Design a protein around this ligand. Structure first.
Ligand code: BCB
Ligand code: BCB
Ligand code: BCB
Ligand SMILES: C/C=C1/c2cc3[nH]c4c(c3C)C(=O)[C@H](C(=O)OC)c4c3nc(cc4[nH]c(cc(n2)[C@@H]1C)c(C(C)=O)c4C)[C@@H](C)[C@@H]3CCC(=O)OC/C=C(/C)CCC[C@H](C)CCC[C@@H](C)CCCC(C)C
Ligand SMILES: C/C=C1/c2cc3[nH]c4c(c3C)C(=O)[C@H](C(=O)OC)c4c3nc(cc4[nH]c(cc(n2)[C@@H]1C)c(C(C)=O)c4C)[C@@H](C)[C@@H]3CCC(=O)OC/C=C(/C)CCC[C@H](C)CCC[C@H](C)CCCC(C)C
Ligand SMILES: CC(C)=CCC/C(C)=C/CC/C(C)=C/CC/C(C)=C/CC/C(C)=C/CC/C(C)=C/CC/C(C)=C/CC1=C(C)C(=O)c2ccccc2C1=O
Ligand code: HEM
Ligand code: HEM
Ligand code: HEM
Ligand code: HEM
Ligand SMILES: CC(C)=CCC/C(C)=C/C=C/C(C)=C/C=C/C(C)=C/C=C\C=C(C)\C=C\C=C(/C)CC/C=C(\C)CCCC(C)C
Ligand SMILES: COC1=C(OC)C(=O)C(C/C=C(\C)CCC=C(C)C)=C(C)C1=O
Ligand SMILES: CCCCCCCCCCCC[N+](C)(C)[O-]
Ligand SMILES: [Fe+2]
Lengths: 323, 258, 273, 332
């Protein structure tokens, strides 16, 4: 049983390697230190880390963002340190509760939330530049940046594009552990059950699919680690028995296969599709669909079931019923 | 009136619904599956009388040849004509193609089945800067075993049949990943060293257990041209050797377990 | 019919039962005894789905639905039209899933590679069992399982969650969702990285492992490494159901209040209450 | 932090939809017992004699009852509202027709309110009806009431910790959370939907596509309403000790018919009845109640689903005394 797949039996140590970037080499700060335990199930070396302007601007904004949020959370518990720590999950920074349309809202009712969102956005943008640049600097394709771009795009969608489209900040996602989660239900309830939103389903399909692909891709490589499967790059440029067997394993199993390079494209695509799909679902929601369930009924999709307990007429529609 | 509502009882969402599936299938069939085909294609099948022609389907499934300009000079273009030049000591066991082949000689040396290796380049995988990537510590001076982990150097290697087969002489490290990939051991009885992928090693404190092959079979382990260097193809020959042991090490290794 | 490099690997052996008997291919498909039993079960299963469907109302795929029995039938068999079909199909699904897995084992042996894949495939089979078999057993009735229907099952999921006011607060769920997201991101980062290295664009040279590691150290100050990310992937993936299975099983048999109230254990610790 | 099996489960939807109650036997037993404390009806008395409207001096509501019947009512009232205090809680030892004590006045309003409930809200309380006990459960101040602010503990028979006091601002979030099944929903469903009838509980669009003219900018309701609604629903579920599927098929909350259970309709009536009660009986009482009972806004304690239900889908597990005390309704 290749134990190498479980953890590294004999760790190794050697001179700290470094690849020069088209720039920013002098911006790598930190002293590479090793961790024995980490190295058991990974690479022991921790650091150094590239700084750069993007990275700094990122922390700059992110922090500003985080600070605006915490201060507001703190303000919720009236700054009582014990309750703040106790009620943390329940604390949050909410978008405007009242309807102001697209008008900038009062600081105490959406204003702060709006600002936090602005700084978080700029922070995300800067980090995107970072993820992108580092790629160019190291002479690599900008694939990650694109997948990450989809993710930032989706955040923008639930964050302000959707609210913009329907014209109301109150639709935004609040900052907070439980709070941002409570939004998922309020949002779904409002748009008539997200389970009936085709894009929700698509997104889930790809998510679940990413699960299937990594479990499968990962197990595949471990299963061929004895042949070097993990050295994917040279497996691409020079097919080796590793990927040949990886391929035949699947072809003989499901009838068709991929290449060591293509499977990464599949995975990349799937990942991307999770975010692209949901972005569309959100862009469509509120804008052109108000109740995904009725929308499905309209197009003959929604399933129906017999009543178990007697069907119940809406009381409010009966003759002579209160308001 | 309704936002999103269009003519013939149809709405924006509904159109996007179709567009979506369209894009998906487009990418999946026209792009991805094409890429899944940059290796192993065009397929192979036995000919006889007359059957010489491009065959329409075979041109449609393939994608345009892409070319990889290697980091240390050279290029590789895929897909491409990479037929198995080698002679396989295998024989048909029955009629139809679905019939499994059978080793006529010794699968381990013949390199068939699980013991099969890819016809990789007969070149030494390099480091980001031309140095040999996989080298033995005797060369990897600045590389060492992490404090706390076993140092197999000196420890004996017990084979499947339970019996010392040799002594771990060295450890080949990946200077690009800082990961030990092979253990070099002296083959007791036949003056010569052999490599064994760490993955086939159960690294203990007093010994190195190797269940893949038997003690004797350690002599036939493929040899390297150099002693402090290894070529991708050699890495395959070596790894492949042990893997074939999993099925061929002994007679029962290939039969039905339960 | 065969990949250019496939000939040499198509050897006999590696089977679990049957030996040479079912050790052969049909097209690219390796058969094996389990491939056979898979077909058997797939056959049986699809058949039952068709008959059941036909005895049902519509034929619209999105609206078709084969449901388990009412709770009153407990763990006993129910008349075909009212749960029996669901019961039969479930057993068939299981026979098919397990057969499919064991078949991957044979294929793995023949190829002389690790059984990692079929092992990884047990997780989903395990979760299926959690939802359909185990939780239903613990609650005492097959009626608690989910219906086999493209939209039908979403409805079951939906109400299930709502039986606990807000399933989002379920700790097992939180854990699981987290892994779904991280895994999704990792696969994007991993696939992205590999492609970024072998496909730098323009006439640029294919890069190296050094570049791989350099990239992530530069970005997040750390790089788990080649082989490790694959292990992490399988790990992250498998933990979606492994941890989630606890949130599912907990619901009902070990917790009957809403999930947000569960966090009362924390919120109500006396010293800060 | 985990309840041991087995769990009692009911079905309330088509097989396969996972709709129904999930009860913890022990918890049910704990509540069945608490409610079993319901005092049995007092032996019926002979209607002999003239109407107390002639006999007693200040009887404005039970004047048609005979003396014997009337005293029986008074005993029952005492036993349900002030058993520990006794008759004197509302009376002057030396003048039973006196109204000096505020509980007297309020008790009169309460007699009317109860009669109303059993008469005008039969679509909710049905033939079970309610008595002073349903809410008071044996004490002048009903264990479960509401002020215009969330308060802890829900049961006022318990003593609040420092943070639980409405005084401690740092405890607001937790006070609210506990009124909405521990959810972080930043809304107080009681004041929003139960104190009066100014707000609409429904928030889901009844059309597939957004109707132009109510789907943009300030025309549309803010998402907050969806949260508020959610909150009200959480507390309703908690107040009855049940889950959403007890009334809804989550597949489509907004839909009725086969998508709703009879109970939902009843719940619908409950909302209206609670609003009626609060707005027209309880709320006004802030005039007769000593400032000691009022909230920080001078409001009188008001009722909500929990006031009667107290964690059970049917107050006191459906116990009734309606037939035993027709003076409490229904009034023909
Ligand atoms: C605990 C929660 C549950 C859940 C929650 C869930 C949600 C919330 C959603 C889905 C969705 C989906 N689910 Mg469900 N689900 C499905 C299958 C499906 C697909 C119809 C669809 C996309 C899945 C996907 O892309 O996979 C990953 C990727 C791939 C490539 C899998 C193979 C292809 C796949 C698209 C479809 C294969 C299944 C066939 C339609 C079944 C045909 C059976 C025939 C052959 C006998 C199966 C077969 C099972 C089993 C075997 O238990 C299951 C269990 C469950 N789902 C749980 C009960 N499911 C989404 C949907 O669109 O609903 C309609 C969705 O929104
Ligand atoms: C009761 C409510 C429901 C709900 C409500 C819901 C909503 C409202 C939405 C989803 C959406 C989605 N849901 Mg659904 N959901 C899903 C699955 C999914 C996801 C696939 C998808 C969003 C994709 C994602 O990964 O977001 C997580 C990934 C994110 C958010 C990316 C973030 C990237 C960003 C760059 C990260 C930045 C990190 C930081 C820098 C930190 C910064 C901090 C600040 C302070 C500085 C499943 C499997 C199920 C099941 C099993 O029931 C389900 C049920 C339901 N969902 C319920 C019906 N769901 C979305 C969708 O697809 O709509 C169409 C969506 O909008
Ligand atoms: C209103 C109700 C909600 C809900 C209720 C819910 C429940 C009730 C459960 C989950 C569960 C889960 N939810 Mg949640 N959910 C999730 C995400 C998730 C998943 C991580 C997890 C997966 C369980 C599972 O799929 O097993 C199903 C998948 C399986 C069994 C795969 C089976 C595959 C099989 C072996 C083979 C199939 C083969 C095909 C038939 C073959 C086809 C052949 C063709 C292709 C040739 C997200 C990301 C969100 C968001 C964003 O809001 C969310 C919201 C919600 N969920 C709602 C709040 N969710 C589960 C959980 O983990 O509890 C915590 C669970 O039980
Ligand atoms: C399907 C595909 C998806 C996907 C994809 C991708 N996802 C990516 C990439 C791709 C492709 C990248 O390349 C990029 C990356 O880099 O990876 C290595 C990245 C990222 N995804 C993160 C989080 C994430 N992805 C999520 C989801 C999905 N991702 C979905 C699933 C979720 C979910 C599930 O919610 C989460 C939480 C970050 C770790 C990471 C950068 C975030 C950032 O932009 O940083 C923002 C920057 C900061 C500096 C934070 C500032 C505050 C710090 C922490 C300090 C604390 C405050 C303190 C200092 C204050 C007091 C002190 C005082 C002095 C002031
Ligand atoms: C945490 C890790 C995960 C993980 C892992 C892995 N996943 C694997 C492997 C690994 C490792 C494989 O090696 C194996 C494979 O070969 O991949 C190519 C496989 C596979 N994962 C499938 C579907 C899949 N994975 C899901 C989830 C995860 N996977 C999670 C995320 C989901 C979700 C998300 O719902 C789906 C739908 C098949 C495509 C594939 C063959 C299954 C099969 O059994 O063949 C058997 C063959 C059949 C032809 C079907 C038989 C039909 C029965 C008889 C009749 C129908 C019954 C049914 C109950 C009705 C449903 C109704 C309604 C709900 C619609
Ligand atoms: C003719 C007949 C009926 C005969 C009897 C015998 C028999 C038992 C036949 C089997 C018939 C059956 C039941 C077929 C069904 C086939 C199935 C289960 C198909 C599912 C296909 C699906 C939907 C897969 C989901 C995953 C997915 C999106 C994959 C696309 C990408 C691929 C091809 C991934 C697999 C893959 C991975 C994961 C690698 O890591 C890897 C690494 C290096 C090289 C190749 C690969 C590789 O191919
Ligand atoms: C305790 C057992 C008890 C007795 C006995 C009692 C008697 C009583 C009498 C005789 C009257 C009529 C006096 C008159 O001439 O008006 C009367 C009227 C009312 N009561 Fe009483 N009462 C006892 C107990 C209680 C308790 C605990 C309360 C307050 C909760 C209460 C209240 C009232 C009210 C109100 C009336 C008016 C009835 C009406 O129709 O308006 N009593 N009581
Ligand atoms: C049944 C006829 C009945 C009686 C009698 C009764 C009496 C009563 C009194 C005397 C009070 C005053 C308590 C105090 O001293 O503060 C009072 C107050 C409230 N009640 Fe009552 N009550 C009867 C019935 C009912 C019913 C059916 C309900 C619940 C719907 C109810 C509710 C309340 C509430 C709330 C108050 C206000 C808070 C308070 O003053 O304690 N009562 N009741
Ligand atoms: C459990 C937390 C739960 C959920 C979830 C839920 C949701 C819900 C929504 C979204 C609405 C509004 C739908 C619309 O816009 O038409 C709504 C409305 C009502 N509900 Fe509900 N509900 C949950 C639980 C419960 C329970 C347990 C009951 C029955 C005891 C119940 C009842 C009702 C009623 C009545 C309405 C309509 C109220 C009105 O004033 O019209 N809900 N619910
Ligand atoms: C608050 C708005 C509220 C809700 C919600 C509610 C719901 C409700 C349901 C769903 C039933 C049906 C129970 C069943 O299993 O069939 C029901 C029944 C009764 N209720 Fe109620 N109820 C709410 C509030 C109140 C209040 C304030 C009182 C007391 C004045 C009250 C009383 C009752 C009674 C009595 C019943 C009995 C009906 C029966 O079938 O036995 N409810 N309620
Ligand atoms: C330009 C004008 C006029 C206005 C601005 C327009 C603009 C672009 C607005 C954008 C708004 C956006 C995009 C809003 C999006 C908000 C979203 C998606 C929020 C979602 C969730 C937030 C959560 C979970 C954060 C809450 C918690 C915190 C603040 C504490 C910090 C985090 C932790 C301690 C947990 C760390 C966990 C782990 C990463 C280590
Ligand atoms: C061969 O491929 C890969 C590596 O090898 C060189 C990596 O090092 C990493 C980077 C991994 C890191 C920083 C740790 C894990 C991160 C998360 C968010 C869970 C990835 C994605 C990868 O694909
Ligand atoms: C529902 C979410 C999206 C699902 C996409 C699934 C892609 C499956 C690809 C199957 C390819 C089949 N093949 C080889 C015959 O082409
Ligand atoms: Fe990979």
């Amino acid at each position: 049983a290749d134990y190498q797949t479980i953890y590294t039996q004999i760790q190794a140590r050697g001179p700290h390697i470094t690849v020069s970037g088209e720039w920013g080499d002098n911006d790598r700060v930190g002293k590479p230190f090793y961790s024995y335990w980490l190295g058991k199930i990974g690479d022991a070396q921790i650091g150094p880390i590239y700084l750069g302007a993007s990275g700094i601007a990122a922390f700059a904004f992110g922090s500003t963002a985080i600070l605006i949020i915490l201060f507001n959370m703190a303000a919720e518990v009236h700054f009582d340190p014990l309750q703040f720590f106790r009620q943390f999950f329940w604390l949050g920074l909410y978008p405007p509760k009242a309807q102001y349309g697209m008008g900038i809202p009062p600081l105490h009712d959406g204003g702060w939330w709006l600002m936090a969102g602005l700084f978080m956005t700029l922070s995300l943008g800067s980090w995107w530049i970072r993820v992108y640049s580092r790629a160019r600097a190291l002479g690599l394709g900008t694939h990650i940046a694109w997948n990450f771009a989809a993710a930032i795009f989706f955040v923008l969608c639930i964050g302000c594009i959707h609210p913009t489209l329907v014209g109301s900040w109150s639709e935004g996602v609040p900052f907070g552990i439980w709070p941002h989660i409570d939004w998922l239900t309020a949002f779904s309830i409002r748009y008539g059950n997200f389970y009936y939103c085709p894009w929700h389903g698509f997104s889930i399909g790809f998510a679940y699919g990413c699960g299937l692909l990594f479990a499968a891709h990962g197990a595949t490589i471990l299963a061929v680690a004895r042949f070097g499967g993990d050295r994917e790059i040279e497996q691409i440029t020079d097919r080796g028995t590793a990927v040949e067997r990886a391929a035949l394993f699947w072809r003989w199993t499901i009838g068709f296969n991929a290449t060591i390079e293509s499977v990464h494209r599949w995975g990349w695509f799937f990942s991307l599709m999770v975010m692209v799909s949901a972005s569309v679902g959100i862009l469509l929601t509120g804008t052109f669909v108000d109740n995904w369930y009725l929308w499905c009924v309209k197009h003959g999709a929604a399933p129906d079931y017999p009543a178990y307990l007697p069907a119940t007429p809406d009381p409010a529609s009966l003759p002579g019923a209160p308001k | 009136m309704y936002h999103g509502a269009l003519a013939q009882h149809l709405d924006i969402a509904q159109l996007v619904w179709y567009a979506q599936w369209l894009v998906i299938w487009t990418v999946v069939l026209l792009y991805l599956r094409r890429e899944d085909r940059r290796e192993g294609y065009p397929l192979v099948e036995p000919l006889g009388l007359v059957k010489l022609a491009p065959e329409d389907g075979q041109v449609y499934e393939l994608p345009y040849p892409k070319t990889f300009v290697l980091p240390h000079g050279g290029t590789v273009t895929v897909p491409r004509r990479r037929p198995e030049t080698r002679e396989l000591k295998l024989a048909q066991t029955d009629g139809f193609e679905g019939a499994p082949l059978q080793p006529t000689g010794n699968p381990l040396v013949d390199a068939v089945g699980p013991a099969s290796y890819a016809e990789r380049a007969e070149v030494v995988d390099a480091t980001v800067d031309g140095k040999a990537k996989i080298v033995p510590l005797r060369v990897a001076t600045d590389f060492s075993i992490a404090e706390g982990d076993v140092d197999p150097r000196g420890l004996p290697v017990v084979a499947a049949d339970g019996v010392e087969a040799g002594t771990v002489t060295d450890l080949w490290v990946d200077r690009s990943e800082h990961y030990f990939r092979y253990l070099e051991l002296s083959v007791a009885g036949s003056a010569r060293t052999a490599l064994i992928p760490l993955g086939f090693c159960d690294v203990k404190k007093d010994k190195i257990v190797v269940t893949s092959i038997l003690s004797e079979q350690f002599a036939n382990v493929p040899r390297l041209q150099s002693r402090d260097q290894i070529t991708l193809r050699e890495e395959d020959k070596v790894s492949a050797y042990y893997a074939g042991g999993l099925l061929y090490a002994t007679p029962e290794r290939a039969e039905s377990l339960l | 019919a065969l990949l250019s490099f496939e000939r040499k690997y198509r050897v006999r052996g590696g089977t679990l039962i049957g030996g040479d008997l079912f050790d052969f291919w049909v097209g690219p498909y390796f058969v094996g005894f389990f491939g056979v039993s898979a077909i058997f079960f797939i056959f049986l299963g699809v058949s039952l789905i068709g008959y059941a469907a036909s005895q049902g109302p519509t034929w619209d795929p999105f609206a078709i639905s084969i449901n388990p029995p009412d709770l009153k039938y407990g763990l006993g068999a129910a008349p075909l039209l009212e749960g029996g079909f669901w019961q039969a199909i479930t057993v068939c699904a299981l026979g098919a899933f397990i057969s499919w897995m064991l078949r991957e084992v044979e294929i793995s042996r023949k190829l002389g590679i690790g059984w990692h894949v079929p092992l990884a495939f047990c997780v989903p089979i395990f979760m299926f069992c959690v939802l359909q078999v185990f939780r239903p057993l613990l609650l005492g009735s097959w009626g608690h399982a989910f219906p086999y229907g493209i939209l039908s099952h979403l409805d079951w999921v939906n109400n299930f969650g709502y039986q606990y006011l807000n399933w989002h607060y379920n700790p097992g769920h939180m854990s699981s969702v987290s892994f779904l997201f991280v895994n999704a991101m990792a696969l994007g980062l991993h696939g992205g990285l590999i492609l970024s290295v072998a496909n730098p664009g323009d006439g640029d040279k294919v890069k190296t492992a050094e570049h791989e590691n350099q990239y992530f150290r530069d970005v997040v100050g750390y790089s788990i490494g080649a082989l490790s990310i694959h292990r992490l992937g399988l790990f992250l993936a498998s933990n979606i159901f492994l941890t989630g299975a606890f949130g599912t099983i907990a619901s009902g048999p070990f917790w009957t209040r809403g999930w947000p109230e569960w966090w009362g254990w924390w919120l109500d610790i006396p010293f800060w209450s | 932090c985990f309840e041991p099996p087995p769990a009692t489960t009911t079905q309330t939807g088509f097989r396969g939809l996972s709709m129904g109650e999930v009860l913890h036997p022990a918890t049910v037993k704990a509540k069945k017992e608490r409610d079993a404390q319901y005092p049995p009806a007092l032996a019926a008395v002979k209607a002999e004699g003239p109407p107390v409207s002639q006999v007693y001096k200040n009887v404005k509501v039970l004047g048609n009852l005979t003396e014997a019947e009337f005293l029986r009512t008074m005993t029952a009232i005492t036993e349900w509202v002030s058993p520990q205090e006794g008759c004197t809680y509302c009376h002057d030892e030396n003048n039973l027709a006196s109204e000096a004590k505020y509980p007297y006045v309020v008790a009169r309003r309460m007699l009317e309110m109860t009669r109303a409930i059993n008469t005008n809200w039969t679509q909710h309380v049905a033939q079970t009806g309610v008595t002073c006990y349903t809410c008071h459960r044996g004490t002048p101040l009903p264990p479960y009431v509401r002020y215009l602010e969330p308060t802890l503990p829900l049961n006022n028979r318990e003593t609040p910790t420092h943070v639980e006091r409405v005084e401690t601002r740092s405890g607001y979030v937790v006070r609210l959370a506990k009124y909405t099944a521990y959810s972080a929903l930043n809304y107080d469903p009681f004041t929003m939907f139960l104190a009066n009838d100014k707000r609409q509980v429904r928030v889901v669009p009844q059309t597939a596509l957004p109707l132009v003219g109510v789907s943009r900018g300030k025309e549309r309701r803010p998402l907050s309403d969806a949260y508020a609604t959610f909150a009200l629903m959480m507390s309703i579920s908690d107040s009855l000790g049940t889950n959403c599927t007890f009334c809804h098929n989550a597949q489509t909350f907004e839909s009725w018919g086969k998508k709703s259970t009879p109970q939902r309709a009843i719940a619908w009536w409950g909302i209206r009845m609670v609003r009626d009660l609060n707005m027209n009986y309880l709320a006004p009482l802030n005039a007769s109640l000593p400032a000691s009972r009022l909230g920080r806004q001078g409001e009188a304690p008001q009722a909500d689903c929990r006031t009667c239900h107290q964690g059970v889908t049917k107050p006191l597990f459906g116990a009734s005394r309606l037939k035993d005390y027709p003076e409490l309704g229904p009034i023909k």
